[PDB]
Amino acid sequence: QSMRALFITSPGLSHILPTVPLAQALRALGHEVRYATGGDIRAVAEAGLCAVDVSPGVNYAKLFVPDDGEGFFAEMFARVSAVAVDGALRTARSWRPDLVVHTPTQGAGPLTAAALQLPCVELPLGPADSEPGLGALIRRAMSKDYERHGVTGEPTGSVRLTTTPPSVEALLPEDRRSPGAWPMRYVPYNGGAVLPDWLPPAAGRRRIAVTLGSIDSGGIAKLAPLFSEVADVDAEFVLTLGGGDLALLGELPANVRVVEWIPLGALLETCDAIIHHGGSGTLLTALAAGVPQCVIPHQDTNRDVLTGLGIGFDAEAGSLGAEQCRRLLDDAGLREAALRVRQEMSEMPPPAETAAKLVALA
Amino acid sequence: QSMRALFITSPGLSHILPTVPLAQALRALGHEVRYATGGDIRAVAEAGLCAVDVSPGVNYAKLFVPDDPMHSEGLGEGFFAEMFARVSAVAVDGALRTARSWRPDLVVHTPTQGAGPLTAAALQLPCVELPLGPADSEPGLGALIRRAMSKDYERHGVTGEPTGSVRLTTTPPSVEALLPEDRRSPGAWPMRYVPYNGGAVLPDWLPPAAGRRRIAVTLGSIDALSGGIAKLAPLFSEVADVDAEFVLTLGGGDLALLGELPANVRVVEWIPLGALLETCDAIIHHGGSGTLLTALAAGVPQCVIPHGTNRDVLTGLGIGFDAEAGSLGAEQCRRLLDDAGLREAALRVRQEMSEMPPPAETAAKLVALA
C-alpha cells in the first residue's frame, strides 16, 4: 500500500527548502514523493528528490513585477501560480497522487487538489507565511484557471501544518495565527555540503555566526563598523556568504572568517550566537539551535518575536559593535530563553511522525 | 534530545548511495546525521546531507592497485583483505578526529570500510553494517580486514570491541534463500530496499506515451571505450522489429553515445533508475550494483547479460533469465514483454520487499539501541 505525495510549491528556494524534510520523511516510510514546481527547482534535485519542471523557460522576474491592499498581491501570486497550472495538472493526472502538498502562495496546489478531488496539506516556511485569507483570495484571482480546467470542486481534506512553536505563535497577532494546524518540528534544511576543515570548534573557543543580505543593512560593507571592534571581542566570527553572491577577500582581523556558503544548521551547531538579517529560515534555524540572536533589520514580525521571547534584540548596522556581541555571548537571560524555545520545538512531532498521520489521512 | 549517527563508508559511489535512505530517515525522525568518507563524497552533499572528507586529495586508484604465481601462497581472501585495509587506512585519522569532535552515539558503516569498526571500537560505540546488496554480504572479511589493519588499531590505541554489532539486509527472504549458506546472514535486520541514485529534474519524455511499452537497458560495467558497447549491436539490429520503446541509460558522468541507433531506441545520458523503471515494463542489464534490487522493487521482469554466478536468482524466482550478448534479440525482448509468468513473479517479489520494514522503522530501532 504505497501512497503518493505530489509537492506543488512556489518557485522560490525559501518556499521549497522547508518542504524537504517532510518529503524525505515520506520516502523513509517507503512512500513516493514527487515535486511539481518551477524556478529554483534544482534545489529539489540537490535534496535527493525528483522534480518535474511545470514551467520550463519561464522568466519569473517579469511575472512578479511585469514591465508596465491584499488584492494587488493576490493578483500577483495568481499570475505566478497560473504558469504552473497546466504542468501541475498534467503531472497529477499521469502520476496520480493520493495527496497534494503545497505552499501558502502556490495557487496551482489547491487547484490541482480540487481537480483530482484530493486532500491538500499546506506547508509554510514560517510564522510570516501563515495567512489563510490569502489562499482564498488567490483562488478567487485564479477563477479563469479553475474555469479553463473545469475545476468547480473543493479539496476533500485541507490540512495545515505549522513548524512554529507555541510561544512564538502566542506573540503573533490573532488573525495571523493558526489553530487547528498540525504541529510539526522545524527540521532545518538548507542543502548538503562537504564540510570545511575549520568548522570543528576549538578548545573552549566561542564563535559568532554572521549572515548577510543581498541589498539594503545588507551588504559586506555595512559591516565595516562591527569590524572595527570585533578584534576586542573574545570570540571567533564567521561571516557566511549566500549562494550566488561573490566576495573579494583581502586583509581581515585575526578572528574574522569570511566564508563560502555553508549549511546554517551545521554552522550554528558550532556557534554560541548569531547575527542575521531576519530571514524566516534563519530565525527558526537559530531557535532550533537554541542560540541567542541579533537582528539587523531592513519584517517587524521577527523583531517582536525576538524581543518578545527574550531570545535576542535588534541592532542598527551602523551602531553594531563589541557591546552587542558581548551581550549575545554573556547575557544569561538570552541564553536561558533560547534553550527554552529549543526545548519547546523539540517536543513537537518530527516529520517522520507527521508523515505517518498523512498516510492515514490519504 | 538528539541521537547522532556517523556514517563511515567506502569511497565508492555504489557503497555510499544505499546508505542514504537510512541517513535520511534518521534526520526525518529529528536526529543528526553526518558522513565521514572520501572519494565520491560529493554524492553525500548531492543527497542533502553533510560530509567530512577524511582523506582530501588522496588518489584512490593507486591504493586499490598500487603502482609466479603458480608457486605463491595466500591467494584468496587474504589478498583482498590487505587491499581494503590499505584503502581504509587513509580514512582512519579523519574518521577518528570527526568522531571525537562530533561525538556520535552510533556508527554506520559498509562491509569493506575498515575505519568504521575501528572508530566504533575506539569510542566504545555500537556499529551497524549497511551493505549495497546480496554480493556485499560476506562476514569474515570484516574480521580479516580488522586483522590486516592491526597497526592502525595499535597506532590509535584501539584494543577494544564495538559494544553492539548489528547487521542490516535489504535482501528479500526469497532471494536470500537462493544464496549459498555461508553467503547468507541470519540475525541481520531486514530493511526495505529503497532505491536511491540521486535526485533530478525529470525529462519531458519520461511519462509513458499512448500506453506504448518500454524496455530499460543498462550498460553496467562497460567502459569508454573498450569496444564493449559493440557487444550490444546484435540486440540493436533487431529492436526495430519489436513493438516497444527502448531506453538506454549510460548511467555515468558526462558520457556520450556515438553512432546510428534504431529509431525506437532512446539514449539518456543519466537518469535515476528507480524513476526510470517506474515507467518500464522490463529491464535488460548486466548485473551491476543495485540494478537487480531496484528492478525487484519496481516489480519488472529482467534479462541479465553476464560476463562469460549469482544470476541464479532470476530463474529461481521465475523473474527472468540470462542471455549471451551475441544472441540477444527480439525473441528475448518479446518474452520479457509478453510472458505472464515472469510478470507475476516480479510483482510477487515486489510485494515481498514492500512488507519489509522501511528505513523509517529501522531508524527508530537504531535510536533505541544507541
XYZ file of C-alpha atoms in Angstrom:
732
model
C 0.000 0.000 0.000
C 2.353 2.725 -1.360
C 0.980 6.259 -1.053
C 1.855 9.117 -3.388
C 2.623 12.692 -2.447
C 2.781 15.452 -5.017
C 4.595 18.527 -3.791
C 3.437 21.655 -5.574
C 5.473 24.598 -4.377
C 6.202 28.261 -5.023
C 9.230 28.656 -7.298
C 11.259 30.387 -4.617
C 14.072 28.470 -2.895
C 12.917 29.642 0.534
C 9.483 28.111 -0.052
C 10.863 24.803 -1.334
C 13.507 24.050 1.315
C 11.165 23.810 4.288
C 9.076 21.187 2.473
C 12.118 18.937 2.056
C 12.307 17.200 5.414
C 8.661 16.085 5.064
C 9.192 14.804 1.512
C 12.229 12.991 2.777
C 10.202 11.544 5.670
C 7.516 10.126 3.358
C 10.212 8.391 1.341
C 11.772 6.986 4.519
C 8.384 5.365 5.254
C 8.519 3.685 1.842
C 6.211 6.058 0.027
C 6.528 8.001 -3.145
C 7.333 11.654 -3.446
C 7.452 13.996 -6.391
C 7.665 17.720 -6.902
C 5.855 19.738 -9.467
C 7.316 23.195 -9.383
C 9.364 25.719 -11.345
C 12.092 28.263 -10.696
C 14.603 27.106 -8.063
C 13.716 23.511 -8.883
C 17.387 22.416 -8.812
C 17.100 22.578 -5.014
C 14.734 19.609 -5.099
C 17.239 17.553 -7.113
C 20.006 18.635 -4.721
C 17.910 17.208 -1.838
C 17.920 13.736 -3.423
C 14.341 14.044 -4.673
C 12.680 14.114 -8.087
C 11.037 17.118 -9.751
C 9.048 17.991 -12.880
C 9.556 21.486 -14.245
C 5.947 22.580 -14.830
C 7.080 25.863 -16.418
C 10.270 25.405 -18.448
C 11.997 28.546 -19.664
C 9.524 30.902 -17.983
C 11.029 34.176 -16.719
C 9.648 34.576 -13.199
C 11.158 38.001 -12.514
C 8.805 39.639 -15.035
C 5.781 37.778 -13.640
C 6.246 39.095 -10.096
C 6.968 42.557 -11.464
C 5.674 42.996 -15.000
C 7.012 45.589 -17.391
C 4.432 48.370 -17.018
C -4.336 46.091 -0.368
C -4.400 42.261 -0.206
C -5.994 42.446 -3.700
C -2.880 43.559 -5.589
C -0.694 40.807 -4.127
C -3.292 38.093 -4.578
C -3.321 39.081 -8.278
C 0.486 38.862 -8.344
C 0.624 35.390 -6.809
C -2.144 34.406 -9.217
C -0.143 35.478 -12.299
C 2.816 33.487 -10.948
C 0.810 30.376 -9.986
C -1.034 30.378 -13.339
C 2.030 29.471 -15.376
C 2.401 26.313 -13.248
C -1.233 25.118 -13.532
C -1.026 23.136 -16.829
C 2.138 21.257 -15.822
C 0.908 20.672 -12.301
C -2.263 19.105 -13.713
C -0.590 17.007 -16.408
C 1.732 15.593 -13.748
C -1.037 14.864 -11.239
C -3.128 13.116 -13.885
C -0.319 10.885 -15.097
C 1.452 10.312 -11.756
C -1.811 10.019 -9.850
C -1.020 11.199 -6.327
C -3.097 10.493 -3.232
C -2.120 13.749 -1.572
C -1.088 17.240 -2.617
C 1.422 19.158 -0.531
C 1.639 22.863 -1.212
C 2.880 26.215 -0.025
C 0.609 29.127 1.011
C 1.017 31.193 -2.173
C 1.306 28.453 -4.788
C -2.239 28.541 -6.153
C -1.649 25.605 -8.521
C -1.610 23.398 -5.455
C -5.201 23.664 -4.216
C -6.383 23.919 -7.797
C -4.748 20.574 -8.589
C -6.029 19.095 -5.363
C -9.634 20.172 -6.101
C -9.367 18.983 -9.699
C -8.422 15.441 -8.636
C -10.637 15.559 -5.566
C -7.658 15.097 -3.239
C -6.849 16.380 0.220
C -4.174 19.007 0.430
C -1.563 19.869 3.015
C -0.278 23.404 3.381
C 3.369 23.707 4.460
C 4.528 27.243 5.294
C 8.132 28.397 5.533
C 7.473 30.082 8.889
C 5.288 32.381 11.015
C 5.030 35.030 8.261
C 3.801 32.709 5.513
C 0.924 31.850 7.853
C -2.047 33.781 6.351
C -5.213 31.886 5.342
C -7.222 34.801 3.958
C -4.674 34.986 1.144
C -5.213 31.431 -0.044
C -8.881 32.212 -0.550
C -8.020 35.455 -2.362
C -5.595 33.659 -4.671
C -8.277 31.081 -5.538
C -10.615 33.965 -6.375
C -7.989 35.733 -8.503
C -7.397 32.418 -10.346
C -11.064 31.901 -11.262
C -10.338 31.780 -15.018
C -7.821 28.989 -14.454
C -10.350 26.995 -12.436
C -12.866 27.645 -15.240
C -10.435 26.683 -18.037
C -9.832 23.254 -16.473
C -13.362 22.716 -15.266
C -12.363 22.710 -11.612
C -15.552 23.566 -9.763
C -14.973 21.491 -6.647
C -13.109 21.583 -3.358
C -10.253 19.631 -1.827
C -11.837 16.886 0.289
C -9.303 17.451 3.050
C -7.449 20.633 3.899
C -4.743 20.177 6.476
C -2.461 22.970 7.643
C 0.950 22.277 9.146
C 2.919 24.623 11.413
C 6.537 24.409 12.374
C 6.004 27.466 14.559
C 6.448 26.734 18.262
C 3.524 27.692 20.607
C 5.346 30.514 22.395
C 6.212 32.165 19.093
C 2.631 31.626 17.923
C 1.391 33.350 21.087
C 3.224 36.537 20.054
C 1.668 36.714 16.586
C -1.487 38.791 16.027
C -4.765 36.883 16.446
C -5.876 36.660 12.763
C -2.216 35.942 11.797
C -2.184 32.716 13.893
C -3.498 29.225 13.001
C -5.244 26.941 15.470
C -6.256 23.540 14.155
C -2.948 23.406 12.296
C -0.854 20.278 12.917
C 2.319 20.940 14.715
C 5.472 19.624 13.084
C 9.022 20.015 14.312
C 11.019 22.529 12.335
C 13.921 20.490 10.971
C 16.373 22.897 9.379
C 17.326 22.178 5.833
C 19.434 24.326 3.500
C 21.268 21.758 1.457
C 24.094 19.312 1.835
C 27.793 20.031 1.763
C 31.328 18.765 2.115
C 32.208 20.462 5.388
C 35.312 22.668 5.612
C 38.335 21.919 7.851
C 37.868 24.940 10.086
C 34.309 24.026 11.080
C 35.036 21.907 14.136
C 35.191 24.151 17.203
C 38.423 24.820 19.109
C 39.261 24.185 22.788
C 36.971 26.498 24.780
C 36.715 28.909 21.874
C 33.459 30.747 21.382
C 32.020 31.596 17.954
C 29.523 34.022 16.472
C 27.820 33.314 13.148
C 27.093 36.323 10.984
C 24.814 36.086 7.955
C 24.175 38.509 5.131
C 21.522 40.131 2.921
C 21.553 40.870 -0.823
C 20.678 44.576 -0.718
C 19.761 47.390 1.688
C 21.505 46.977 6.222
C 22.592 44.330 3.742
C 25.974 44.043 2.079
C 29.518 43.256 3.105
C 30.443 46.934 3.596
C 27.724 47.924 6.084
C 29.562 45.508 8.364
C 32.578 47.869 8.408
C 31.967 49.310 11.899
C 31.350 45.973 13.630
C 34.712 45.006 12.134
C 36.491 47.887 13.809
C 35.585 46.294 17.140
C 35.460 42.515 16.726
C 39.189 42.461 17.474
C 38.272 43.490 21.067
C 35.799 40.607 21.484
C 36.947 37.239 22.839
C 35.352 35.176 20.092
C 35.690 33.958 16.532
C 33.358 35.448 13.964
C 32.194 33.543 10.915
C 30.598 35.556 8.124
C 28.777 33.338 5.634
C 28.019 34.402 2.127
C 24.821 33.211 0.490
C 24.996 31.098 -2.661
C 25.259 33.435 -5.632
C 26.975 36.421 -4.066
C 30.665 36.912 -4.807
C 33.255 38.176 -2.313
C 36.751 39.609 -2.730
C 38.626 38.760 0.426
C 41.758 40.615 1.478
C 43.066 41.571 4.926
C 40.869 40.550 7.878
C 41.119 40.813 11.648
C 42.711 37.782 13.270
C 39.323 36.391 14.428
C 37.077 37.097 11.462
C 36.481 34.379 8.983
C 34.726 35.196 5.735
C 33.389 32.048 4.232
C 31.781 30.445 1.211
C 28.227 29.221 1.642
C 27.716 26.616 4.320
C 24.570 24.927 5.708
C 23.417 27.187 8.503
C 22.203 24.385 10.786
C 25.616 22.765 10.549
C 27.264 26.112 11.245
C 25.045 27.105 14.212
C 25.638 23.716 15.804
C 29.177 25.044 16.489
C 28.145 28.630 17.364
C 27.234 30.469 20.600
C 25.244 33.209 18.922
C 24.044 34.607 15.595
C 23.850 37.973 13.910
C 21.477 37.954 10.962
C 19.120 39.931 8.805
C 15.772 38.433 9.681
C 15.258 35.653 7.131
C 12.411 33.362 8.375
C 14.703 30.401 7.594
C 17.393 31.948 9.776
C 15.247 32.694 12.821
C 13.709 29.192 13.107
C 17.019 27.505 12.424
C 18.591 29.595 15.162
C 15.629 28.875 17.505
C 16.220 25.179 16.847
C 19.900 25.635 17.681
C 18.959 27.351 20.980
C 21.305 30.221 20.257
C 20.809 33.909 21.162
C 20.132 36.186 18.237
C 20.690 39.694 16.991
C 18.733 41.069 14.049
C 19.816 43.832 11.762
C 16.517 44.984 10.408
C 15.708 46.318 6.937
C 9.639 42.157 8.761
C 8.741 43.666 12.161
C 7.367 40.170 12.910
C 10.723 38.603 13.606
C 11.780 41.754 15.537
C 8.958 41.270 18.036
C 9.408 37.516 18.170
C 12.985 38.141 19.288
C 12.291 40.722 21.973
C 9.014 39.087 22.912
C 10.562 35.762 23.800
C 13.588 37.406 25.416
C 15.747 35.486 22.950
C 17.533 38.454 21.409
C 17.305 42.010 20.155
C 17.575 44.294 17.132
C 20.565 46.486 16.242
C 21.251 49.089 13.540
C 24.125 48.008 11.300
C 25.982 51.300 11.864
C 25.789 51.011 15.671
C 26.688 47.324 15.876
C 29.867 46.624 17.862
C 31.576 44.827 20.759
C 28.891 45.839 23.268
C 26.185 43.853 21.425
C 28.483 40.947 20.784
C 29.390 40.699 24.474
C 25.709 40.834 25.386
C 24.950 37.925 22.970
C 27.834 35.915 24.459
C 27.468 36.670 28.186
C 23.807 37.545 28.883
C 22.403 34.580 30.803
C 18.838 35.770 30.169
C 19.103 35.491 26.384
C 20.705 32.062 26.710
C 18.046 30.642 29.019
C 15.193 31.825 26.812
C 16.844 30.361 23.678
C 17.332 26.922 25.259
C 13.734 27.108 26.454
C 12.313 27.568 22.933
C 14.696 24.925 21.626
C 13.209 22.547 24.169
C 9.720 23.547 23.096
C 10.477 22.917 19.388
C 11.942 19.502 20.183
C 8.667 18.374 21.798
C 6.867 18.959 18.509
C 6.326 15.875 16.358
C 9.150 15.209 13.920
C 8.475 14.942 10.183
C 8.527 11.155 10.426
C 5.576 11.237 12.841
C 3.745 13.799 10.688
C 4.401 11.629 7.589
C 2.576 8.710 9.224
C -0.501 10.796 10.026
C -0.632 11.959 6.416
C -0.574 8.378 5.142
C -3.526 7.709 7.445
C -5.404 10.754 6.067
C -4.735 9.786 2.443
C 17.313 15.164 22.879
C 19.032 14.170 19.618
C 20.886 10.963 18.754
C 23.925 11.128 16.462
C 24.811 8.836 13.582
C 28.226 8.884 11.982
C 28.236 7.223 8.586
C 31.679 5.880 7.715
C 31.610 4.460 4.216
C 33.769 3.079 1.437
C 34.769 5.832 -1.036
C 32.878 4.204 -3.901
C 29.610 5.777 -5.057
C 27.901 2.392 -5.121
C 28.668 1.883 -1.432
C 27.515 5.339 -0.374
C 24.164 5.562 -2.208
C 22.458 2.645 -0.434
C 23.226 4.223 2.939
C 21.364 7.419 2.015
C 17.745 6.443 2.631
C 18.631 5.419 6.202
C 20.581 8.633 6.849
C 17.626 10.498 5.512
C 15.286 8.515 7.749
C 17.263 9.353 10.895
C 17.005 13.027 10.018
C 13.241 12.675 9.412
C 12.990 11.406 12.999
C 14.694 14.582 14.204
C 18.152 13.125 14.702
C 21.540 14.055 13.454
C 23.443 12.514 10.594
C 26.957 13.003 9.307
C 29.265 11.221 6.904
C 32.967 10.651 7.262
C 34.171 9.308 3.960
C 36.364 10.078 0.944
C 36.303 9.604 -2.793
C 32.804 10.037 -4.249
C 31.882 12.206 -1.261
C 30.071 14.784 -3.457
C 27.275 12.235 -3.637
C 26.511 12.762 0.057
C 26.304 16.527 -0.447
C 24.076 15.961 -3.507
C 21.715 13.946 -1.271
C 21.183 16.977 1.008
C 23.421 15.575 3.727
C 26.686 16.712 5.289
C 30.084 15.086 4.888
C 33.636 15.429 6.059
C 36.346 14.465 3.607
C 38.557 12.289 5.834
C 41.170 11.943 3.044
C 41.427 15.129 0.970
C 43.397 14.920 -2.276
C 44.216 11.209 -1.919
C 44.477 9.232 -5.176
C 42.404 6.110 -4.530
C 43.189 4.404 -7.858
C 46.781 3.744 -6.743
C 45.643 2.386 -3.350
C 43.395 -0.286 -4.853
C 46.030 -1.108 -7.462
C 49.443 0.038 -6.292
C 51.941 1.386 -8.785
C 54.886 -16.547 -10.168
C 52.275 -17.022 -9.035
C 51.829 -20.757 -9.600
C 54.213 -21.106 -6.671
C 52.652 -18.433 -4.459
C 50.580 -18.829 -1.272
C 47.611 -16.944 0.292
C 45.649 -16.173 -2.860
C 42.016 -15.525 -1.969
C 40.532 -13.616 0.975
C 43.938 -12.597 2.414
C 44.922 -10.593 -0.665
C 41.707 -8.573 -0.840
C 41.571 -8.006 2.891
C 45.043 -6.439 2.546
C 43.726 -4.253 -0.310
C 40.699 -2.982 1.596
C 42.995 -2.375 4.574
C 45.309 -0.129 2.551
C 42.230 1.798 1.345
C 40.528 2.038 4.741
C 43.776 3.110 6.450
C 43.885 6.504 4.747
C 40.426 7.256 6.228
C 41.247 6.299 9.814
C 42.728 9.564 11.100
C 39.877 11.688 9.721
C 37.228 9.239 10.836
C 38.634 9.421 14.371
C 39.100 13.201 14.522
C 35.493 13.589 13.393
C 34.067 11.055 15.839
C 35.898 12.697 18.756
C 34.765 16.222 17.960
C 31.258 15.403 16.661
C 30.685 12.718 19.268
C 28.270 10.251 17.671
C 26.177 7.663 19.505
C 26.238 5.208 16.628
C 28.490 4.297 13.741
C 27.017 3.207 10.429
C 29.456 1.542 8.045
C 29.842 -0.516 4.913
C 31.268 -4.093 4.789
C 34.731 -3.151 3.496
C 35.283 0.235 5.171
C 37.582 -0.812 7.978
C 37.740 2.687 9.507
C 34.154 2.129 10.597
C 34.527 -0.654 13.170
C 37.852 0.796 14.217
C 36.183 4.109 15.042
C 33.273 2.326 16.706
C 35.590 0.281 18.963
C 37.718 3.346 19.777
C 34.713 5.267 21.118
C 33.121 2.136 22.546
C 30.075 2.530 20.295
C 27.761 0.074 18.590
C 28.056 -0.254 14.854
C 25.629 -1.009 12.082
C 26.694 -2.616 8.843
C 24.814 -1.495 5.733
C 25.603 -3.473 2.564
C 24.875 -2.409 -1.008
C 23.269 -5.764 -1.772
C 23.440 -9.581 -1.679
C 27.046 -9.726 -3.043
C 28.408 -7.290 -0.427
C 27.013 -9.638 2.252
C 30.094 -11.523 3.409
C 31.134 -11.531 7.070
C 34.551 -12.994 7.832
C 36.169 -10.482 5.518
C 35.313 -7.865 8.141
C 37.359 -9.856 10.631
C 40.198 -10.240 8.089
C 40.263 -6.509 7.405
C 40.482 -5.797 11.154
C 43.424 -8.203 11.319
C 45.149 -6.612 8.315
C 44.646 -3.189 9.987
C 46.340 -4.210 13.255
C 48.977 -1.465 13.023
C 46.229 1.158 12.702
C 44.452 -0.195 15.784
C 47.847 -0.157 17.564
C 48.720 3.391 16.423
C 45.480 4.768 17.931
C 45.457 2.525 20.969
C 42.259 0.782 19.963
C 42.263 -2.522 21.809
C 38.526 -2.910 22.336
C 35.366 -4.049 20.585
C 32.181 -2.363 19.427
C 29.603 -2.871 22.196
C 26.883 -3.561 19.642
C 27.308 -5.033 16.181
C 24.161 -5.043 14.133
C 23.809 -6.032 10.516
C 21.136 -4.827 8.138
C 19.958 -6.574 4.969
C 17.818 -5.175 2.226
C 17.784 -8.567 0.541
C 14.265 -10.080 0.455
C 13.813 -13.590 2.016
C 13.183 -15.417 -1.267
C 16.383 -14.034 -2.768
C 18.247 -14.854 0.473
C 17.019 -18.460 0.238
C 18.805 -18.839 -3.105
C 22.211 -17.617 -1.847
C 24.810 -20.158 -0.609
C 24.664 -20.902 3.126
C 27.840 -19.072 4.318
C 26.957 -16.193 1.906
C 23.654 -15.515 3.758
C 23.098 -13.564 7.014
C 20.654 -14.673 9.695
C 20.285 -12.358 12.658
C 20.578 -9.420 10.265
C 17.725 -6.899 10.486
C 15.602 -6.743 7.429
C 15.144 -3.282 5.948
C 13.187 -2.374 2.840
C 15.414 -1.636 -0.134
C 14.557 1.907 -1.062
C 16.304 2.667 -4.330
C 18.424 5.790 -4.405
C 20.696 7.123 -7.161
C 20.265 10.840 -6.819
C 17.673 13.467 -7.484
C 16.856 15.060 -10.774
C 14.720 17.359 -12.778
C 12.901 14.689 -14.760
C 12.838 14.957 -18.564
C 9.634 15.594 -20.560
C 9.747 12.229 -22.337
C 9.744 10.196 -19.132
C 5.979 9.855 -18.693
C 4.917 6.936 -20.905
C 3.031 7.861 -24.055
C -0.010 6.150 -25.565
C 0.492 3.141 -23.301
C 3.440 2.365 -25.544
C 5.529 -0.308 -23.837
C 9.069 0.436 -22.666
C 12.252 -1.532 -22.006
C 15.087 -0.105 -19.911
C 18.600 -1.062 -20.990
C 21.722 -0.542 -18.856
C 25.484 -0.652 -19.604
C 26.670 -1.798 -16.194
C 30.473 -2.076 -16.071
C 31.086 -1.334 -19.784
C 33.869 1.251 -20.124
C 34.562 4.031 -22.610
C 35.804 2.916 -24.981
C 36.973 -0.685 -24.847
C 34.596 -1.579 -27.652
C 32.375 -3.220 -25.027
C 29.285 -1.441 -26.345
C 29.746 -3.270 -29.656
C 28.510 -6.207 -27.582
C 25.030 -4.668 -27.960
C 24.980 -4.420 -31.755
C 23.014 -7.658 -32.256
C 20.235 -6.525 -29.943
C 20.005 -3.174 -31.802
C 19.850 -4.837 -35.199
C 16.524 -6.360 -34.074
C 14.868 -3.828 -31.694
C 13.289 -2.154 -34.733
C 11.159 -5.335 -35.119
C 9.867 -5.092 -31.524
C 6.710 -3.146 -30.667
C 8.353 -1.227 -27.805
C 10.448 1.792 -26.888
C 13.932 1.121 -25.595
C 15.653 3.471 -23.149
C 19.424 3.126 -22.811
C 20.980 4.690 -19.668
C 24.706 5.415 -19.782
C 24.334 5.980 -16.055
C 27.540 7.910 -15.890
C 29.136 11.309 -15.677
C 29.009 13.232 -18.935
C 29.133 10.030 -21.061
C 28.217 10.172 -24.755
C 26.927 7.560 -27.192
C 28.004 7.900 -30.796
C 26.600 6.214 -33.897
C 23.443 5.208 -35.731
C 20.847 3.709 -33.398
C 17.490 2.306 -34.294
C 14.634 4.818 -34.203
C 12.842 3.136 -31.257
C 15.966 3.478 -29.143
C 16.401 6.430 -26.857
C 19.654 7.382 -25.180
C 19.664 9.157 -21.863
C 22.967 10.455 -20.504
C 21.893 9.835 -16.914
C 18.660 9.255 -15.044
C 17.552 7.953 -11.659
C 16.939 4.272 -12.357
C 14.063 3.942 -9.921
C 12.277 6.802 -11.634
C 13.002 5.217 -14.987
C 11.911 1.673 -14.070
C 8.653 3.040 -12.623
C 7.692 3.674 -16.283
C 9.221 0.486 -17.710
C 7.683 -2.917 -18.455
C 11.063 -4.699 -18.380
C 14.819 -4.293 -17.953
C 17.926 -5.557 -19.756
C 21.040 -5.268 -17.622
C 24.492 -6.527 -16.756
C 24.073 -7.332 -13.064
C 25.561 -4.074 -11.806
C 25.456 -2.821 -8.212
C 21.841 -2.431 -7.238
C 20.262 -2.758 -10.662
C 18.796 -6.087 -9.582
C 17.254 -4.812 -6.308
C 15.981 -1.653 -7.919
C 14.375 -3.828 -10.639
C 12.944 -6.168 -7.996
C 11.473 -3.146 -6.171
C 9.913 -1.941 -9.430
C 8.331 -5.383 -9.982
C 9.656 -5.603 -13.526
C 10.818 -8.745 -15.442
C 14.536 -8.917 -16.063
C 17.152 -10.074 -18.504
C 20.802 -10.293 -17.464
C 23.928 -10.338 -19.611
C 26.750 -11.955 -17.648
C 30.478 -11.843 -18.388
C 31.381 -15.149 -19.999
C 27.293 -16.610 -10.908
C 24.586 -15.112 -8.648
C 22.388 -14.750 -11.729
C 20.760 -17.932 -10.423
C 18.355 -15.629 -8.539
C 16.362 -14.761 -11.661
C 15.303 -18.254 -12.865
C 14.833 -19.398 -9.263
C 12.062 -16.859 -8.627
C 10.767 -17.148 -12.204
C 11.549 -13.461 -12.579
C 13.826 -13.510 -15.571
C 16.723 -15.138 -17.362
C 20.250 -14.672 -18.697
C 21.179 -14.031 -22.315
C 24.519 -14.002 -24.092
C 25.177 -10.573 -25.604
C 25.753 -12.027 -29.071
C 22.479 -14.000 -29.075
C 20.302 -11.274 -27.556
C 17.454 -10.135 -29.820
C 13.735 -9.656 -30.434
C 12.863 -13.149 -29.155
C 14.078 -12.287 -25.644
C 12.507 -8.854 -25.709
C 9.105 -10.291 -26.645
C 9.420 -12.846 -23.864
C 10.135 -10.065 -21.308
C 7.116 -8.114 -22.574
C 4.539 -10.883 -23.091
C 5.401 -13.719 -20.673
C 2.734 -13.637 -17.939
C 4.826 -15.982 -15.756
C 7.754 -13.554 -15.481
C 5.392 -10.693 -14.695
C 3.538 -12.481 -11.911
C 6.811 -13.474 -10.203
C 8.150 -9.923 -10.429
C 5.085 -8.411 -8.766
C 5.283 -11.137 -6.130
C 8.824 -10.203 -5.063
C 7.918 -6.527 -5.201
C 5.143 -7.323 -2.742
C 7.609 -9.252 -0.542
C 10.109 -6.349 -0.442
C 7.360 -3.895 0.416
C 6.463 -5.877 3.564
C 9.994 -5.391 4.894
C 10.381 -2.589 7.397
C 11.040 0.761 5.749
C 14.106 2.804 6.678
C 11.950 4.950 8.951
C 11.073 1.917 11.073
C 14.698 0.717 11.099
C 15.881 4.184 12.051
C 13.680 4.086 15.155
C 15.106 0.748 16.345
C 18.618 2.116 15.959
C 17.802 5.169 18.093
C 16.639 2.732 20.766
C 19.836 0.647 20.513
C 22.004 3.778 20.905
